[PDB]
RNA sequence: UGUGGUGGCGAUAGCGAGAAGGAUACACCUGUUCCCAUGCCGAACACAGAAGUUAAGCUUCUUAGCGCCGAUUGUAGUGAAGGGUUUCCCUUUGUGAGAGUAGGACGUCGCCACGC
RNA sequence: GGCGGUCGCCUCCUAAAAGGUAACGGAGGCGCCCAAAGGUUCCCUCAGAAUGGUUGGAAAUCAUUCGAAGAGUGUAAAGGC
RNA sequence: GAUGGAGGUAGAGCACUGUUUGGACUAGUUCAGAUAAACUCCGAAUGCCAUUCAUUUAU
């Protein structure tokens, strides 16, 4: 779609030269994108995962999973298997459209332009964004929203050393500092 | 004035036929809890892990790889 | 809550089996396809009211 | 008195010492040792009495290693009570010591202070003893 | 990330198929290999540890299609060739695959041309 | 011979470090029309393929750092037969460890297919 | 002797490397539960730790890398997996 | 007497669970040293079960 051209036409020559890759298999990629919502409020009101899921599906053409307890802790009134949050996974074209709407439309709606921190790379080459609310997107609306909540993002790639992903990630967008 | 004092009946577990002994079909070879010993050629397992012959032959206790044991029965 | 029970055949009316159930878990009557020895056949047996 | 935190069993058997030490028969951390030549039980109070006597004599400190720990409990019944019902209540702690075991170690102090201190510790104890030094290996400083 | 190889994940299922299936000389073992461009087949007895017949996908002379149709030819070939060696009573080891796709094609062709399963 | 497959034998067969290789084969890789699939996702499993590449798996070769297999002689115990106080200790005769070591070891045996 | 406790059944130690073995010896459980928590066919692999991530904190839920078992097994403990 | 076997005791060991002493360290793992009846990576002497076996003997 939009970036396969961009890879095979701007970036793969760059990255293949910057680290002197003897093969093109060696060039990193983007494998997944996984979205998280930590609700933690089906504890009280059962009608909270519902809105979380409505918003996340307004984003992407995909009904999200439902993550449950996985154990029972009394600090949060948790039994086992109390459905807590929802998640989504994105392959192929769902990833490039979503990255494009992240870099070119949605993200800059956030003010105080701190972009993306750099203590955010796991030490192995995958990256995780951060979002506080939901209003940052053109798929969301004004009134329908009722809570200030936002979503976690993780972008996983095939890279050994962090800096390789640093470049392969800035080169496609994601306006770092 | 003690609160101990109770036990259960002994169960007579162990080996009921020897290595190198000839045996007729159906005879018990070993009573156990769980598989301490495993079943081999021409031997079955019961409902509570007892091992029995299926065929008449001689009994041979062997070694199952590195850390397990086997019983087999071999007809003449 | 657990109660012993009898399942009765539905064509020849012979009580062929004895079994269990929990009657706050299963409120209605059990129903199984069991071999009926009088007719030498598999038949719908049902629990005696 | 030394006491084990958190035992797993409240009572246990006693026997059967049958002397010969299984473990530390050489000096490990100090320069001088106190080795038992008979086999006996040694209690909390005997160890503390010996330790206090040994440390008081060494003005300017030095260092002292106690190498014997009471793991095993006692029990006992009371006067005026007939034989019969279950074990008594636990009263005490002990360690069994077999002949050969080194029990204390001292360093940082010349011979005579160390020898006098080990002499004063042994009169507090129910065993016969010797005094030993680190003798000869690949390296003994 | 580390994608695992598929061949080890199917060795791990093959070793559990084989706790039941095994082949003697009255009832040899019809095995199957399925690679990215072929499928193979051997007829194996295990007390002696040997092969009695075989047929391979695109090694010898099969072609006339390159859909699943390559498999049915191999099934028919091992059927004929094993009936040449006095063999009718084999047992089928799937490998670790499903009895579903182009392994089912080979198996079916085996059952039409001489081998009772 | 080389490679693919499928088997026996207690890892002496394993782990980690290092190199090399694409002849066929093995793989990664490319797609979702059709058989089938995701408690979301063609990721997997299923199928259609053959642009691209030896980077990763795979194969071969070097390495005794980690595991594994370890003798010999000395002890500890203990069958029989005897002696002191009998808590415990000792002497004859037979058996003999666990530790700790000298050494071994980077597999060995077999069937099928194709290529040289 | 009385008062106190105990009286059937299961698991461990005592128990002396087959089986068996006392004491008002040392420790615990049972008098049920499950219509699936039974049968069978396919498929799967755990507990933790470290790193990042908005609410969210040590610890709910996401991603990666180490991880032979340090988990689970309706219910006591042993033997098994 | 010879040959095969089942089994965890006397040792002694710290891989697993309890109990425990010194030292280095750091997050803000390590080096040594002990110990056990209900601990075990290990493991005897003897006893026990067998055998178309052998030599004496009489059950
Ligand atoms: Zn009827």
Numbering used by the authors:
A (entry chain F): 2 to 178
B (entry chain X): 18 to 93
C (entry chain 3): 1 to 49
D (entry chain N): 1 to 141
E (entry chain P): 2 to 118
Paper text:
Ribosomes are the ribonucleoprotein machines responsible for protein synthesis. Here, our goal was to investigate the structural conservation of the Enterococcus faecalis ribosome compared to Escherichia coli, a model organism for structure-based development of ribosome-targeting compounds. In the analysis of the E. faecalis 70S ribosome structure determined by cryo-electron microscopy (cryo-EM) to a global resolution of 2.8 Å, we find that structural differences are located predominantly in peripheral regions, while the organization of the functional centres and antibiotic binding sites remains conserved. The cryo-EM structure of E. faecalis 70S ribosome presented here revealed that the architecture of functional centres and subunit interfaces remain conserved when compared with E. coli and S. aureus.
Structure determination by cryo-EM using multi-body refinement produced molecular maps that reached 2.8 Å for the 50S subunit, 3.0 Å for the 30S body domain, and 3.2 Å for the 30S head domain by gold-standard Fourier shell correlation. These maps were used to generate models for the 30S head and body domain and the 50S subunit. In the 16S rRNA, larger structural variations are located in solvent-exposed and peripheral sections of the beak (rRNA helix h33a), the spur (h6) and the body (h7, h10 and h44). A similar pattern can be seen in the 23S rRNA, where peripheral regions show structural differences for parts of the 5S rRNA, for the functionally important L1 and L7/L12 stalks, and for 23S rRNA helices 9, 16, 18, 28, 33, 54, 58, 59, 98 and 99, among others. We observed more significant structural differences for the C-terminal domain of ribosomal protein uL15. The sequence identity for uL15 between E. faecalis and E. coli is 50%, and the rmsd between α carbons of the two protein structures is 3.4 Å. The E. faecalis structure contains a number of loop regions that are shifted with respect to their location in the E. coli structure. However, two short helical regions that are visible in the E. faecalis structure but absent in the E. coli structure are also absent in the more closely related S. aureus structure. We also found structural differences in ribosomal protein bL33. The cryo-EM map for bL33 is consistent with a zinc-binding motif, which is present in one of these genes. For bL33, the E. faecalis structure is similar to the zinc-binding paralog observed in the T. thermophilus ribosome.
